[PDB]
């Protein structure tokens, strides 16, 4: 099967990690 | 029931709020 | 029909584009 809901939950987790990386970057670069 | 699609729609809304916070931060800190 | 999973996959794609815009902004503004 294609399990698009499971794939989407995974895509959600990848985007959370990208936003967390940007939050950290801002902190680390002291903006 | 577990309603994973509803949970995922909610998770989507939390990530939109996190990205909006970063967009605002950039504006507010004048980068 | 309402196809909430398809709508959510689309919402996912809009949020990826917003995060990519912020990643690019940081690069372009040289933070």
UniProtKB/TrEMBL annotation, chains A, B, C:
It is found in: Host cell membrane; Virion membrane. Signal peptide: none annotated. This is Env polyprotein. The lineage of its organism: Viruses, Riboviria, Pararnavirae, Artverviricota, Revtraviricetes. The gene is env.
């Amino acid at each position: 099967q294609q399990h698009l809901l499971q794939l989407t939950v995974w895509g959600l987790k990848q985007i959370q990690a990208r936003i967390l990386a940007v939050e950290r970057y801002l902190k680390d670069q002291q903006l």
